[PDB]
Write a protein that binds this DNA or RNA. Structure first.
Ligand SMILES: [Mg+2]
Ligand SMILES: [Zn+2]
Ligand SMILES: [Zn+2]
Lengths: 115, 49, 262, 140, 45, 32, 147, 391, 69, 56, 184
RNA sequence: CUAAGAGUAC
C-alpha cells in the first residue's frame, strides 16, 4: 500500500540531479556532496579511493536512511586543492583500475580451455 | 485429510466444544469458613441417567 | 599494471579465481555490482487467456517471471521506460507464448521448453529459455490433469536485480580474504582452542601460515581475495564478471559526466 | 615542544589482565630511587616484556621548533619531521590528577584515550608537568 | 482445525481451576491455553 | 527381531502409537 | 514467528547485496536480534537451528522429538564432520564494505510461520467520517471508517 | 497508557511504509515492543493546542520523570551492548572507520581528535570517538566497587569536560539511572541537548556495531567439562544435604523453628538448600564463561539478561514452585503416578536439576509447565486488579 | 504446492531438478543427501529448497476439473 | 464514562510500530497514506499564501 | 502399556514383545497377505489398557521401558535421569511426548524451552499460515489464506506425522542469522 | 441498522 516503487532505487526523479555540492562551514576547504539514487556500492569505493589520495585531509560517507537510495560524502583537502578535483582524481583512478582488471580477466579467461 | 466431527448448519461448519462439569453421584466433603456456623459440609450432586 | 587476476577453475556456470593487488572496497563493489546491477532479460508482463489449472494466475505469472532467459545480447535491447512505443515493441521486449492442453490421461507437465518466441528477435541472441538439465525439459512451470488448459502470453523486458530479484544472473558469489587471519579482522570465538575449533578454509593452502612467533604486522592491508562467481544461466559466468566490471566502470563514468556537466 | 620530562625505566611486571591487545606495566626508574611508573600499553603494537629497559619521555609538543588539540589532526605528510621520529611508541593524552603522595613525592595521572598512566616521584623534577595535554614517547 | 476439534471449555467457587493440576498429566496439554481471560479454563486434549 | 518374545525398545513404541492412530484418528471422541 | 514463541514484525528489508554473507556466498533470509535469546531462554530455538543446519547438509531429517537422547554434542560433532564450526558460528562479511565482521555469527536454517496479523489489515486513519446517529460521535471500527 | 510519559508529543516525519516509526530510546516510557504492538496518533487542530503540545508534552521535556526524580529514557538494547564493546580498553579504531564515525555525528565540529596512539600506527580508542558525542562541558564521576583513581578493572566512570577519562560505558552510565550521563546532561544543558545526545550516541554506536557485528549462539550456553563436573558435584552435595535433613526429620530428630510447625521448618530448609545449590552452580557456570561469551557480554552491558538466565540455561533450572511452595501432592500423597507415595525427594516435588541446554525430563517438563501456568494466571489477575486500583 | 523455480536465498534455479530428484530417489535408491549432491546442490540453502518441498499439486490434480474442455 | 469522560475522536490514526535507529528521539515516522488522510487546518496568512496555494 | 511379573526373566517386563511389534509393522506395511493386527487386537489380548485419572491414583507408571524395567561411565552431554530405585511398576508410558496436545506437538525440542514460550507457540501456531485443506479451490469460505510454497520442517518431531504436518505444512525453512546487524 | 455471542492482538 505505502510501498514505494522499486525503480525509485536507481531512477532519478523529476527535478533532481545526480550530484549536489554544498560548501561545509565546520572546517575550511570542505564540501559535502549528496549522491542521489546511489548506495554503498559507489560510496565505499569513492571514499577509499579518496583516502588513497595524499592531499585529502578528510573523506567519509554515510547513508542517512536505508529507505532512500542516497548518500552524503564529506571531503576536505589541503589548502589550494579543490575537493571537486579530488573527486575527479578518485573517479579517474577507479576507472583506470577497473579497465586494467577487465583486461587482465579477459586475458586470463582466454587462456582457459575447459570452459 | 478432512477429519469430520463437525456439523453443517446453514452452510457453516459448527463444532461443539467439550463442556467440562463436575461428576455426579460423588460425595465431596468441604471445610467451611470460620465465620459460618457450619464447619464441614458433605454433599452429593445426585443424578440418574 | 593494476589489479591482478589468476583463475583457478573455469566451467560453464562457475569461475573460481583470485583477485590480487586490489583494494577491499573495489572487490566488494565488484561483488555487489555482480549481484545487483547487471542487466538481464526476464518475463515482466503476463496476459492469461485461459487457465483451468489448479494454480492461480499470478502464481503462474510469478513462476514465469523467475524463468531464466538468454541474455547474451541484452545490451542491444532497450529499456521499456525509455522506448518510444506505447506499451511494448520489438526494440525493447521479447514476446513469448505458452499454450498447453491436458490431452493425456496422465499428468502433463508444462515445462519452460514449451515457451515459444513470437516476436521477431531481429537476429539478436536473447529470449530463449535456458535449458540446463540432460533431459532437455527446462523449469517445471505447471502440471495439467486431463482436460485442463493453459493459454497465456508473456512480454519480457530487460531489468536489473535491484528492481526485482528475477533479473539477477549471479546466484551465489563466494568471497573470502586473509584465510589465516593475519590481519586480525576477526576475533575467533572458542571454548578451548580457536585453531582446532575453526576448520581451515580451502584457500589456506594458497598463503603462507603465520610463524606463531612473529609480531603482528600492523601495516599489511587486505588484498588477494578469493572469489567464486556462479551463473544462473542467463549469461556465461565470464560474461557475468566482465559485465559487472563494465557496469561499475559505467557508474563511475556517469559520476564524472554529471560532475563535469554541472 | 621541549621534553617536560625524560628518564629510563626498568619494567618489573607486565599484567595482561582481561585484555588481548593492552597490558599494564609497572616500572622503576633506573637512576632515581623514588620515581616509579604505571602505564597501559598497546602491546600488540609495541611488545614489552619484563626486565626491559625503556626510555620514557613526556613532551608538550612533537614539533622540533619551540612552541609559538585545538587544531584538527592531519595525517603525517611525507617529509614531516617530528620528535616521534626518534622514538618507537608515541601516545597523546591529558593529565587529570595531581596527587600529593607525600611531602616530597607527587603523582601525575594521564589518560591516553582510556590507557592510564601514573608517574610518581619527587616534585623537584616532576614540576614541569601541569594540567594539560601531553605526548608520551617511549623507545626500547 | 485439529486443535479446535479437541477443545474443552470450563464454565466459570472456592477452587483454583486455572492451575495446571497434577491430574492433568497425559489427559490435557500441559502447555496449550489462551493467554487472555480463558487461561487455564480452556484446555486441549 | 529374531526372538519373538524379546522385550521391546523405546523405538518400538511408535509402532504401537501408529496402530492407535490408525484405528482412532484425531477426532475419534466427537464421532464416537 | 518461530516455533518457540519468538514472534516479531519485519523492521526493514535489505536486498541480497546489503545482507551479511559467509565465505560461500550464503546470505540469511532473516536476521533476528541476539537480545531476544538470553531473557526468554529459548535454547530450543538455537538447538533446532543447529539440527536444521546438520539435516540440510546431510539430507536427513532432524529428529527434534522432546524426550529423546539427542544432545547438542552429537549435533555439533555431525556438523563438524561436514566441515563447519561445531557450534554453528560462521565467519561473515559486512555487506556494505565487504570487511570481515569482528564477531562470528550464529547462522542456519530455522522454521518460521507467517502469522495472520498483517499491517495492511490494521492501518487505519480518520479525519472526518460517519457519525453515530444517537450520540453524534464517530462510529466504531476500521471497517466503518470509525474513530 | 498508565502514566503521562505514555502519551507524548512527537515531530512528524513522513516515511514510505505502512508502520509508525519511533526511536529505540523512547520505547521504555511507552513500554512498547515491535512484536505486533499498535500505537495511536492524534493531530491537534488549532495553534493553541499545537503550541501547548509542543511546549508541554514534547518528548525531550519528559526525559526526567517526576515519578522517581530520575530519567525515564536511556540507551537500550543493541546500542547499549554496542557501547560496552566500544569503550573497552582493547577497542581501537583505524583512520577510515574513525572518519566515518565522526561524520556520523550530526553536530561534530569538524576537527579530527588527536589519536590516542600516534606511533607506530595512528589509532583511536573507542572512548575517544564516543566522547565526540558527549557535549562539551559535562563532568561525571562514579566509583564502582573497588575502583581507584587508576582503574585496574576499568570499572567506574570518570568523564572530564565531555571526554571519557576512564571507565567502561554501560547501563549505569547511559541507562535511565539517577546520576548517570542522561541525568547530568539534561540538568546541565537542557532537554534539547539531551535529545541530541541520545541521537548522536545511537548513531555512532550503531554504526560501529554494524561494522563490528555481534551474535549469540548455542555455544554461548556451554560450559567446559570440568565446570559441568563441578556443577554436578554441587547438585549432588545439595541432594545429599536434603537427604540428610529428610533422615533427621523422619527420625523426628529435627526440632521445629519457633513460630512454625515441623513440616514447615523441613520445607524451609529443603527449599533453602536447593536455592543456594542453584545459585552456587550458576555462579560456577558464570565464572567459567569467558569474556568473549555473548550472553556474558549482554549481561555485563546490562542490555538484556541476568545471572539467573545464565544459571538456568547452563547450570540448573532450579526448584519449581506453585503458590510459593514446592509442587503439591495432586494425587494421593504423590505429585505424579511415576513416584511412590510420600516421596519428599527434590526430584519428586519439582526440582529441575537439568539446564535448558541439557533438556528436561518429562516430570521436570511438567513441573516447569505448572510453574509457567502459575506465572500466566498471575499476569492476568494482576493486570485486572491493578487497572481497577489505578482508576 | 509445486517445486519453486529458484532457491530463495541465493537464487540458484532448482525448478528443473524436481523430477530428476524424484527419479534418483526412486529408480536409483539413493538417499536424499547423495541425490542432492548429484544434482549439484552444494549450499544448504538449495539443499533445503529441494529437500523440504512438499508437492501438494498432486493432491490438487486428483479433483475433477471445474471447467473441462 | 462511555461518552463524556471518554469518547471516540476524529483526526486520529492507529497502526503497528517499528523501530528506527535513524530517527531522532522526538521524531515519529508517519506512513504516507496516514499523512494524506489526517489533516490540519491552517489559516491563510500573507506569510503562508504561497505554500498553501501550492498545496491546494 | 501393561507390565506383569514375567517369571521367565525373573523381573517385571512389558507384556508387549517384538512379535506384536512385528505384526503391527506388517499390518501397517500392508496398508501402505497377513492377518490384520490393529490397536483393538492389542486391547483384546491384554497388551494395552485404558486408564483415567481416578484409576491412575492406584497405579505406578514407568516413564520409559528400556531404562526403568531392568534391574540395575555416562555421557556428560545427556540429561540427568533418576532410576526411581523402585521395582513394583504396574504400567509403562507408551511415550512421554504423548502428554502434549496437537499444537504443542509441533514444537521442536519443547523440553529445551521455558514453558511460557511453549504456551505462546501453542497459541500462535493456530495463526500460522499454511494449507488448511487440499480442496480449498472448491470451497467458498469467507476467508482463506494459503502459502505459495509450504515446506516441511527440517527439524521435525515423531508425533507430527500423525498430524499430517509434513503433508500440510504451515511455514518455511528460512536461513536465519542471529546478529546485531543494523539495529533495525 | 441494532443487539447478542464467539474467537483474537498488545
Ligand atoms: Mg509487545
Ligand atoms: Zn518499445
Ligand atoms: Zn541456494
Amino acid at each position: 500500500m505505502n510501498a514505494p516503487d522499486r525503480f525509485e532505487l536507481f531512477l532519478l526523479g523529476e527535478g533532481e540531479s545526480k550530484l549536489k555540492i554544498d560548501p561545509d562551514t565546520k572546517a575550511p576547504n570542505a564540501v559535502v556532496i549528496t549522491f542521489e539514487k546511489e548506495d554503498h556500492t559507489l560510496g565505499n569505493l569513492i571514499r577509499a579511493e579518496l583516502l588513497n589520495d595524499r592531499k585529502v585531509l578528510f573523506a567519509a560517507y554515510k547513508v542517512e536512511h536505508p529507505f532512500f537510495a542516497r548518500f552524503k560524502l564529506r571531503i576536505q583537502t589541503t589548502e589550494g586543492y579543490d575537493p571537486k578535483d579530488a573527486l575527479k582524481n578518485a573517479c579517474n583512478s577507479i576507472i583506470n583500475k577497473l579497465g586494467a582488471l577487465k583486461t587482465n580477466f579477459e586475458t586470463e579467461w582466454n587462456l582457459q580451455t575447459l570452459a | 485429510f478432512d477429519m469430520g466431527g463437525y456439523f453443517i448448519i446453514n452452510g457453516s461448519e459448527k463444532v461443539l466444544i467439550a463442556q467440562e462439569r463436575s461428576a455426579g453421584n460423588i460425595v465431596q466433603v468441604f471445610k467451611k469458613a470460620a465465620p459460618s456456623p457450619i464447619s464441614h459440609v458433605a454433599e452429593i450432586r445426585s443424578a440418574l441417567e | 599494471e593494476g589489479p591482478q587476476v589468476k583463475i583457478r577453475e573455469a566451467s560453464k556456470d562457475n569461475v573460481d579465481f583470485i583477485l590480487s593487488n586490489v583494494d577491499l572496497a573495489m572487490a566488494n563493489s565488484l561483488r555487489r555490482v555482480m549481484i545487483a546491477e547487471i542487466p538481464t532479460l526476464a518475463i515482466d508482463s503476463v496476459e492469461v487467456e485461459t487457465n483451468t489449472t489448479v494454480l492461480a494466475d499470478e502464481f503462474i505469472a510469478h513462476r514465469l517471471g523467475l524463468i531464466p532467459l538468454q541474455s547474451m545480447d541484452i545490451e542491444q535491447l532497450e529499456y521499456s521506460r525509455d522506448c518510444f512505443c506505447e506499451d511494448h515493441c520489438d526494440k525493447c521486449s521479447v514476446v513469448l507464448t505458452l499454450q498447453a492442453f491436458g490431452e493425456s490421461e496422465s499428468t502433463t507437465n508444462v515445462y519452460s521448453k514449451d515457451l515459444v518466441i513470437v516476436s521477431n528477435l531481429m537476429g539478436r541472441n536473447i529470449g530463449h529459455p535456458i535449458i540446463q538439465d540432460k533431459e532437455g525439459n527446462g523449469v517445471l512451470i505447471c502440471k495439467l490433469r486431463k482436460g485442463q488448459e493453459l493459454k497465456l502470453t508473456c512480454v519480457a523486458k530487460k531489468g536489473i536485480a535491484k528492481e526485482h530479484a528475477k533479473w539477477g544472473p549471479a546466484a551465489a558469489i563466494e568471497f573470502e580474504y586473509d584465510p589465516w587471519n593475519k590481519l586480525k579482522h576477526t576475533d575467533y570465538w572458542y571454548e578451548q582452542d580457536s585453531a582446532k575449533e575453526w576448520p581451515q578454509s580451502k584457500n589456506c593452502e594458497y598463503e603462507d601460515p603465520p610463524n606463531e612467533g612473529d609480531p603482528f604486522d600492523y601495516k599489511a592491508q587486505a588484498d588477494t581475495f578469493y572469489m567464486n562467481v556462479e551463473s544462473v544461466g542467463s549469461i556465461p559466468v565470464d560474461q557475468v564478471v566482465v559485465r559487472g566490471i563494465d557496469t561499475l566502470q559505467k557508474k563511475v563514468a556517469s559520476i564524472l559526466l554529471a560532475l563535469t556537466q554541472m | 615542544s621541549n621534553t617536560l620530562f625524560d628518564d629510563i625505566f626498568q619494567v618489573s611486571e607486565v599484567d595482561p589482565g582481561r585484555y588481548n591487545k593492552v597490558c599494564r606495566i609497572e616500572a622503576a626508574s633506573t637512576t632515581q630511587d623514588q620515581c616509579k611508573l604505571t602505564l597501559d600499553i598497546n602491546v600488540e603494537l609495541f611488545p614489552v616484556a619484563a626486565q626491559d629497559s625503556l626510555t620514557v619521555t613526556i613532551a608538550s609538543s612533537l614539533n622540533l621548533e619551540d612552541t609559538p588539540a585545538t587544531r584538527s589532526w592531519r595525517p603525517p605528510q611525507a617529509g614531516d619531521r617530528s620528535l616521534a621520529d626518534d622514538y618507537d611508541y608515541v601516545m597523546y593524552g591529558t593529565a587529570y590528577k595531581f596527587e600529593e603522595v607525600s611531602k616530597d613525592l607527587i603523582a601525575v595521572y594521564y589518560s591516553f584515550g582510556g590507557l592510564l598512566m601514573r608517574l610518581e616521584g619527587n616534585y623537584r623534577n616532576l614540576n614541569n608537568l601541569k594540567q594539560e595535554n601531553a605526548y608520551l614517547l617511549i623507545r626500547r | 482445525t485439529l486443535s479446535h476439534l479437541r477443545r474443552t471449555n470450563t464454565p466459570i467457587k472456592l477452587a483454583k481451576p486455572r492451575q495446571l493440576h497434577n491430574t492433568h498429566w497425559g489427559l490435557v496439554c500441559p502447555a496449550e491455553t489462551p493467554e487472555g481471560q480463558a487461561c487455564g479454563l480452556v484446555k486441549n486434549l | 527381531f529374531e526372538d519373538e518374545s524379546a522385550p521391546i525398545t523405546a523405538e518400538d513404541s511408535w509402532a504401537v502409537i501408529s496402530a492407535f492412530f490408525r484405528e482412532k484418528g484425531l477426532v475419534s471422541q466427537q464421532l464416537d | 514467528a518461530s516455533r518457540h514463541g519468538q514472534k516479531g514484525t519485519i523492521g526493514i528489508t535489505y536486498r541480497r547485496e546489503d545482507m551479511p554473507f559467509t565465505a560461500e556466498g550464503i546470505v540469511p533470509d532473516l536476521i533476528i536480534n541476539p537480545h531476544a535469546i538470553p531473557s526468554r531462554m529459548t535454547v530450543a530455538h538455537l538447538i533446532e537451528c543447529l539440527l536444521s543446519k546438520v539435516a540440510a547438509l546431510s539430507g536427513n531429517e532432524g529428529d527434534a522429538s522432546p524426550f529423546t537422547d539427542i544432545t547438542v554434542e552429537g549435533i555439533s560433532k555431525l556438523l563438524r564432520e561436514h566441515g563447519y564450526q561445531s557450534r554453528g558460528f560462521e565467519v561473515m562479511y559486512n555487506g556494505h564494505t565487504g570487511k570481515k565482521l569482528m564477531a562470528q555469527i550464529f547462522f542456519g536454517p530455522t522454521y518460521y510461520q507467517r502469522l495472520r496479523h498483517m499491517v495492511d489489515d490494521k492501518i487505519h486513519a480518520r479525519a472526518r467520517g460517519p457519525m453515530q446517529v444517537l450520540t453524534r460521535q464517530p462510529v466504531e471500527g476500521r471497517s466503518r471508517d470509525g474513530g | 497508557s498508565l502514566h503521562k510519559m505514555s502519551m507524548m508529543a512527537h515531530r512528524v516525519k513522513v516515511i514510505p511504509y505502512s508502520t509508525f516509526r519511533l526511536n529505540l530510546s523512547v520505547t521504555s516510557p511507552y513500554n512498547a515492543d515491535f512484536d505486533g504492538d499498535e500505537m495511536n496518533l492524534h493531530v491537534p487542530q488549532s495553534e493553541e493546542t499545537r503550541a501547548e503540545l509542543s511546549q508541554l508534552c514534547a518528548v525531550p521535556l519528559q526525559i526526567v520523570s517526576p515519578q522517581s526524580n530520575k530519567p525515564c529514557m536511556g540507551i537500550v538494547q543493541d546500542t547499549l551492548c554496542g557501547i560496552r564493546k566500544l569503550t573497552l580498553r582493547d577497542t581501537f579504531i583505524e583512520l577510515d572507520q574513525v572518519l566515518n564515525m565522526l561524520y556520523w555525528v550530526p553536530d561534530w565540529d569538524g576537527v579530527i581528535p588527536t589519536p590516542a596512539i600516534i606511533k607506530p600506527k595512528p589509532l583511536w580508542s573507542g572512548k575517544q570517538i564516543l566522547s565526540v558525542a558527549i557535549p562539551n562541558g559535562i563532568h561525571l564521576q562514579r566509583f564502582d566497587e573497588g575502583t581507584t583513581l587508576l582503574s585496574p578493572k576499568d570499572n567506574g566512570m570518570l568523564i572530564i569536560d565531555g571526554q571519557i577519562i576512564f571507565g567502561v560505558v554501560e547501563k549505569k552510565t547511559v541507562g535511565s539511572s539517577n546520576g548517570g550521563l542522561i541525568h547530568v546532561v539534561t540538568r546541565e544543558k537542557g532537554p534539547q541537548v539531551c535529545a541530541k545526545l541520545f541521537g548522536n550516541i545511537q548513531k555512532v554506536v550503531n554504526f560501529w556495531l554494524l561494522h563490528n557485528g555481534f551474535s549469540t549462539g548455542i555455544g554461548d550456553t556451554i560450559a567446559d567439562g570440568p565446570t559441568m563436573r563441578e556443577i554436578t558435584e554441587t547438585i549432588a552435595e545439595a541432594k545429599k544435604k536434603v537427604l540428610d535433613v529428610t533422615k533427621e526429620a523422619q527420625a523426628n530428630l529435627l526440632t521445629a523453628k519457633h513460630g512454625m510447625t515441623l513440616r514447615e521448618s523441613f520445607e524451609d530448609n529443603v527449599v533453602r538448600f536447593l536455592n543456594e545449590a542453584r545459585d552456587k552452580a550458576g555462579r560456577l557456570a558464570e565464572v567459567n564463561l569467558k569474556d568473549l561469551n555473548n550472553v556474558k557480554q549482554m549481561v555485563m552491558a546490562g542490555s538484556k539478561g541476568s545471572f539467573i538466565n545464565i544459571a538456568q540455561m547452563s547450570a540448573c533450572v532450579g526448584q519449581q514452585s506453585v503458590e510459593g511452595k514446592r509442587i503439591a501432592f495432586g494425587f494421593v500423597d504423590r505429585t505424579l503416578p511415576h513416584f511412590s507415595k510420600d516421596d519428599y525427594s527434590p526430584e519428586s516435588k519439582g526440582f529441575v536439576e537439568n539446564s535448558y541446554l541439557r533438556g528436561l525430563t518429562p516430570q521436570e517438563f511438567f513441573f516447569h509447565a505448572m510453574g509457567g501456568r502459575e506465572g500466566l494466571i498471575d499476569t492476568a489477575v494482576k493486570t485486572a486488579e491493578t487497572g481497577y486500583i489505578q482508576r | 504446492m509445486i517445486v519453486p523455480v529458484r532457491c530463495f536465498s541465493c537464487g540458484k534455479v532448482v525448478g528443473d531438478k524436481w523430477e530428476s530428484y524424484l527419479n534418483l530417489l526412486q529408480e536409483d535408491e539413493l538417499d536424499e543427501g547423495t541425490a542432492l549432491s548429484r544434482l549439484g546442490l552444494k549450499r544448504y540453502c538449495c539443499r533445503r529448497m529441494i529437500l523440504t518441498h512438499v508437492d501438494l499439486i498432486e493432491k490438487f490434480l486428483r479433483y475433477n476439473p471445474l471447467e473441462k474442455r | 464514562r462511555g461518552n463524556l469522560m471518554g469518547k471516540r475522536v476524529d483526526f486520529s490514526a492507529r497502526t503497528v510500530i517499528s523501530g528506527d535507529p535513524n530517527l531522532e528521539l522526538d521524531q515519529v515516522g508517519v506512513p504516507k497514506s496516514i499523512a494524506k488522510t489526517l489533516t490540519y487546518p491552517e489559516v491563510v496568512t500573507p506569510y503562508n499564501i504561497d505554500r498553501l496555494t501550492q498545496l491546494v | 502399556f501393561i507390565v506383569e511379573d514375567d517369571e521367565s526373566l525373573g523381573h517385571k517386563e512389558l507384556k508387549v514383545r517384538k512379535g506384536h511389534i512385528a505384526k503391527l509393522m506388517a499390518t501397517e506395511y500392508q496398508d501402505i497377505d497377513v492377518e490384520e493386527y490393529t490397536w483393538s487386537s492389542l486391547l483384546n489380548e491384554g497388551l494395552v489398557e485404558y486408564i483415567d485419572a481416578e484409576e491412575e491414583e492406584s497405579i505406578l507408571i514407568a516413564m520409559q521401558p528400556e531404562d526403568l524395567e531392568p534391574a540395575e561411565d555416562v555421557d556428560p552431554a545427556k540429561r540427568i535421569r533418576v532410576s526411581h530405585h523402585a521395582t513394583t511398576f504396574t504400567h509403562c508410558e507408551i511415550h512421554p511426548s504423548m502428554i502434549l496436545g496437537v499444537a504443542a506437538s509441533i514444537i521442536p525440542f519443547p523440553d529445551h524451552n521455558q514453558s511460557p514460550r511453549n504456551t505462546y507457540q501453542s497459541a500462535m501456531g493456530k495463526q500460522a499460515m499454511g494449507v488448511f485443506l487440499t480442496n480449498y479451490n472448491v470451497r467458498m469460505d469467507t476467508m482463506a489464506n494459503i502459502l505459495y510454497y509450504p515446506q516441511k520442517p527440517l527439524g521435525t518431531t515423531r508425533a507430527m506425522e500423525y498430524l499430517k504436518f509434513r503433508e500440510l505444512p504451515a511455514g518455511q525453512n528460512a536461513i536465519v542469522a542471529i546478529a546485531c546487524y543494523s539495529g533495525y
